[PDB]
Enzyme design. Structure first.
Site, PDB file in Angstrom:
ATOM      1  N   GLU A   1       5.334   2.927   0.265  1.00 20.50           N
ATOM      2  CA  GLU A   1       6.752   2.787   0.485  1.00 20.50           C
ATOM      3  C   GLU A   1       7.072   3.420   1.831  1.00 20.50           C
ATOM      4  O   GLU A   1       6.320   4.276   2.338  1.00 20.50           O
ATOM      5  CB  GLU A   1       7.578   3.368  -0.670  1.00 20.50           C
ATOM      6  CG  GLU A   1       7.396   4.859  -0.923  1.00 20.50           C
ATOM      7  CD  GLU A   1       8.282   5.411  -2.025  1.00 20.50           C
ATOM      8  OE1 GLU A   1       9.523   5.256  -1.934  1.00 20.50           O
ATOM      9  OE2 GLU A   1       7.735   6.014  -2.977  1.00 20.50           O
ATOM     10  N   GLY A   2       8.071   2.856   2.471  1.00 22.76           N
ATOM     11  CA  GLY A   2       8.548   3.341   3.747  1.00 22.76           C
ATOM     12  C   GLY A   2      10.049   3.462   3.659  1.00 22.76           C
ATOM     13  O   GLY A   2      10.673   2.914   2.740  1.00 22.76           O
TER      14      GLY A   2
ATOM     15  N   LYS B   1       4.449  -2.633   8.401  1.00 23.06           N
ATOM     16  CA  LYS B   1       5.684  -1.985   7.955  1.00 23.06           C
ATOM     17  C   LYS B   1       6.765  -3.054   7.985  1.00 23.06           C
ATOM     18  O   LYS B   1       6.930  -3.741   8.993  1.00 23.06           O
ATOM     19  CB  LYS B   1       6.043  -0.788   8.840  1.00 23.06           C
ATOM     20  CG  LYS B   1       5.015   0.352   8.699  1.00 23.06           C
ATOM     21  CD  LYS B   1       5.417   1.648   9.369  1.00 23.06           C
ATOM     22  CE  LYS B   1       6.602   2.326   8.702  1.00 23.06           C
ATOM     23  NZ  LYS B   1       6.727   3.734   9.157  1.00 23.06           N
TER      24      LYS B   1
ATOM     25  N   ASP C   1       3.516  18.155  14.703  1.00 24.71           N
ATOM     26  CA  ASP C   1       3.082  18.274  13.324  1.00 24.71           C
ATOM     27  C   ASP C   1       1.599  17.993  13.155  1.00 24.71           C
ATOM     28  O   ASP C   1       1.218  17.088  12.401  1.00 24.71           O
ATOM     29  CB  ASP C   1       3.947  17.437  12.341  1.00 24.71           C
ATOM     30  CG  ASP C   1       3.789  17.891  10.886  1.00 24.71           C
ATOM     31  OD1 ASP C   1       3.505  19.087  10.663  1.00 24.71           O
ATOM     32  OD2 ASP C   1       3.901  17.043   9.983  1.00 24.71           O
TER      33      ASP C   1
ATOM     34  N   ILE D   1       0.819  -1.221   0.000  1.00 21.96           N
ATOM     35  CA  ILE D   1       0.000   0.000   0.000  1.00 21.96           C
ATOM     36  C   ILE D   1       0.849   1.265   0.000  1.00 21.96           C
ATOM     37  O   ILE D   1       0.305   2.368  -0.096  1.00 21.96           O
ATOM     38  CB  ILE D   1      -1.040   0.013   1.156  1.00 21.96           C
ATOM     39  CG1 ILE D   1      -0.334   0.103   2.561  1.00 21.96           C
ATOM     40  CG2 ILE D   1      -2.011  -1.174   1.019  1.00 21.96           C
ATOM     41  CD1 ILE D   1      -1.214   0.145   3.810  1.00 21.96           C
TER      42      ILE D   1
ATOM     43  N   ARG E   1      -2.250  15.937   6.737  1.00 22.66           N
ATOM     44  CA  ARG E   1      -1.347  14.915   6.166  1.00 22.66           C
ATOM     45  C   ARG E   1      -1.061  13.792   7.197  1.00 22.66           C
ATOM     46  O   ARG E   1      -0.690  12.690   6.808  1.00 22.66           O
ATOM     47  CB  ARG E   1      -0.003  15.547   5.670  1.00 22.66           C
ATOM     48  CG  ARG E   1       0.782  16.289   6.753  1.00 22.66           C
ATOM     49  CD  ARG E   1       2.154  16.812   6.279  1.00 22.66           C
ATOM     50  NE  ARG E   1       2.627  17.809   7.240  1.00 22.66           N
ATOM     51  CZ  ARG E   1       2.302  19.100   7.189  1.00 22.66           C
ATOM     52  NH1 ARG E   1       1.578  19.570   6.186  1.00 22.66           N
ATOM     53  NH2 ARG E   1       2.694  19.924   8.141  1.00 22.66           N
ATOM     54  N   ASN E   2      -1.239  14.080   8.513  1.00 23.41           N
ATOM     55  CA  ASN E   2      -0.954  13.090   9.556  1.00 23.41           C
ATOM     56  C   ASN E   2      -2.223  12.425  10.092  1.00 23.41           C
ATOM     57  O   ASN E   2      -2.182  11.747  11.109  1.00 23.41           O
ATOM     58  CB  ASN E   2      -0.085  13.716  10.656  1.00 23.41           C
ATOM     59  CG  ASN E   2       1.296  14.060  10.150  1.00 23.41           C
ATOM     60  OD1 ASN E   2       1.905  13.302   9.406  1.00 23.41           O
ATOM     61  ND2 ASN E   2       1.780  15.246  10.447  1.00 23.41           N
TER      62      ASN E   2
ATOM     63  N   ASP F   1       1.453   9.759  12.547  1.00 25.03           N
ATOM     64  CA  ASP F   1       2.594  10.621  12.240  1.00 25.03           C
ATOM     65  C   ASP F   1       3.448   9.952  11.181  1.00 25.03           C
ATOM     66  O   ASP F   1       3.611   8.734  11.224  1.00 25.03           O
ATOM     67  CB  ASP F   1       3.433  10.989  13.464  1.00 25.03           C
ATOM     68  CG  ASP F   1       4.264  12.244  13.212  1.00 25.03           C
ATOM     69  OD1 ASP F   1       3.947  12.987  12.255  1.00 25.03           O
ATOM     70  OD2 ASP F   1       5.219  12.487  13.974  1.00 25.03           O
TER      71      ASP F   1
ATOM     72  N   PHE G   1      12.266   2.054   5.511  1.00 28.25           N
ATOM     73  CA  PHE G   1      12.943   0.788   5.795  1.00 28.25           C
ATOM     74  C   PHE G   1      12.510  -0.389   4.916  1.00 28.25           C
ATOM     75  O   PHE G   1      13.173  -1.427   4.892  1.00 28.25           O
ATOM     76  CB  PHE G   1      12.800   0.457   7.282  1.00 28.25           C
ATOM     77  CG  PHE G   1      13.539   1.466   8.147  1.00 28.25           C
ATOM     78  CD1 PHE G   1      14.794   1.174   8.664  1.00 28.25           C
ATOM     79  CD2 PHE G   1      12.955   2.683   8.479  1.00 28.25           C
ATOM     80  CE1 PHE G   1      15.480   2.106   9.444  1.00 28.25           C
ATOM     81  CE2 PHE G   1      13.635   3.610   9.268  1.00 28.25           C
ATOM     82  CZ  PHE G   1      14.895   3.317   9.744  1.00 28.25           C
TER      83      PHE G   1
ATOM     84  N   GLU H   1      -2.864  -0.851  13.366  1.00 30.67           N
ATOM     85  CA  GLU H   1      -4.210  -0.986  12.825  1.00 30.67           C
ATOM     86  C   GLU H   1      -4.300  -0.340  11.419  1.00 30.67           C
ATOM     87  O   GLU H   1      -3.625   0.642  11.138  1.00 30.67           O
ATOM     88  CB  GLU H   1      -5.277  -0.415  13.778  1.00 30.67           C
ATOM     89  CG  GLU H   1      -5.323   1.100  13.816  1.00 30.67           C
ATOM     90  CD  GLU H   1      -6.369   1.661  14.759  1.00 30.67           C
ATOM     91  OE1 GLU H   1      -7.579   1.470  14.500  1.00 30.67           O
ATOM     92  OE2 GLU H   1      -5.974   2.342  15.732  1.00 30.67           O
ATOM     93  N   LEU H   2      -5.059  -0.952  10.538  1.00 24.82           N
ATOM     94  CA  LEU H   2      -5.242  -0.377   9.213  1.00 24.82           C
ATOM     95  C   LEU H   2      -6.419   0.621   9.254  1.00 24.82           C
ATOM     96  O   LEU H   2      -7.473   0.323   9.833  1.00 24.82           O
ATOM     97  CB  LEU H   2      -5.536  -1.471   8.182  1.00 24.82           C
ATOM     98  CG  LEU H   2      -5.653  -1.005   6.717  1.00 24.82           C
ATOM     99  CD1 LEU H   2      -4.285  -0.733   6.117  1.00 24.82           C
ATOM    100  CD2 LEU H   2      -6.339  -2.080   5.857  1.00 24.82           C
ATOM    101  N   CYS H   3      -6.223   1.794   8.621  1.00 26.27           N
ATOM    102  CA  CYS H   3      -7.270   2.794   8.419  1.00 26.27           C
ATOM    103  C   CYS H   3      -7.611   2.644   6.939  1.00 26.27           C
ATOM    104  O   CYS H   3      -6.872   3.114   6.073  1.00 26.27           O
ATOM    105  CB  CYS H   3      -6.761   4.185   8.770  1.00 26.27           C
ATOM    106  SG  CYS H   3      -6.338   4.368  10.518  1.00 26.27           S
TER     107      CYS H   3
END
Ligand SMILES: Cc1ccc(-n2nc(C(C)(C)C)cc2NC(=O)Nc2ccc(-n3cnc4c(N)ncnc43)cc2)cc1
Length: 271
Positions: free
Chosen positions: A16-17, A40, A132, A14, A136-137, A150, A19, A86-88
């Site tokens: 890129e991260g 992740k 922040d 879903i 976006r968060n 975050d 790591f 948890e998935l949103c």
């Protein structure tokens, strides 16, 4: 917090991260009913220094338990190392608001501001400064539920603020004057940012000060200029946003007051 990998059904990638890839999946928990999760992954966590940097996220998230903050489900510390949250399912709040601009009622917009004020009153109770607060968060679990999280490369770094400046990505347009001028981040500066975040929600995911250079924002704010009242924003809600934007941080409300007032505004809108 250790989780058995065989209980996780790894789904599609879903995102890129820093790591490794981030996937969605299903956790067939031994104690709770099955749940959708974001996973992740960490490609080089076989190295102790990479693993410690990656797991900082789990260490921070583990402290909190609130219905409007993304929950850490667990970690798999055997290679390959995974962090399970948890998935949103409905994704980022900004795209959600843009796509549903003509479908969402004002009551749903105020409800999202209210839910985020409860998450922030909770973090303030733990004396935790987010630094922040911005759309976006925020992620969307359902059309009536949002969650604060975050994101970003600077969160993994030792000097977070320094990294943002190097790439010219400091969020000047969301920042309180004392954060811009002195790099001071407190409960009061989170309140300022929350005011900007409420404005973004009422504006259906439009960014503040679009087409204005960062250096010019500082000057406008110092001169008493503020983001305009969004269309269909109730006057009481705008008054609350203008209090979040008091130049003097000691004149700003705290999140418990914001939450009580947003509950009243929501009740009045629904009535
Ligand atoms: C280094 C570091 C990085 C981040 C944090 N930190 N801090 C917080 C507070 C303070 C708010 C608890 C939360 C976080 N993390 C997340 O929110 N992660 C996070 C990671 C994936 C997903 N996630 C859930 N659904 C989705 C989806 N559909 N698409 C993409 N990502 C999703 C949600 C949250 C802490 C340290």
């Amino acid at each position: 917090y250790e989780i058995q990998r065989e209980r996780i059904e790894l789904g599609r990638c879903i995102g890129e991260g820093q790591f490794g890839d981030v996937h969605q999946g299903i956790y067939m928990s031994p104690e709770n009913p099955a749940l959708a999760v974001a996973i992740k992954t960490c490609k080089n966590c076989t190295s102790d220094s990479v693993r410690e940097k990656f797991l900082q996220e789990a260490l921070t998230m583990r402290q909190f338990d609130h219905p409007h903050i993304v929950k850490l489900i667990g970690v798999i510390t055997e290679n390959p190392v995974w962090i399970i949250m948890e998935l949103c399912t409905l994704g980022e709040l900004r795209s959600f608001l843009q796509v549903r601009k003509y479908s969402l009622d004002l009551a749903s917009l105020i409800l999202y501001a209210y839910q985020l004020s409860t998450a922030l009153a909770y973090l303030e109770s733990k004396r935790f400064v987010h630094r922040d607060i911005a759309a976006r968060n925020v992620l969307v679990s359902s059309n009536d539920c949002v969650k604060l999280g975050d994101f970003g490369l600077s969160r993994y770094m030792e000097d977070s603020t320094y990294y943002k400046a190097s790439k010219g990505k400091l969020p000047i347009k969301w920042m309180a004057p004392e954060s811009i001028n002195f790099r001071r981040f407190t409960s009061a500066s989170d309140v300022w940012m929350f005011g900007v975040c409420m404005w973004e929600i009422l504006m259906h995911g439009v960014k503040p000060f679009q087409g204005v250079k960062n250096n010019d924002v500082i000057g406008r704010i110092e001169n008493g200029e503020r983001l305009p009242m969004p269309p269909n924003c109730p006057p009481t809600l705008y008054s609350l946003m203008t209090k979040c934007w008091a130049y003097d941080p000691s004149r700003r409300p705290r999140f418990t007051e914001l939450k009580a007032q947003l509950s009243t505004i929501l009740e009045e809108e629904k009535a």
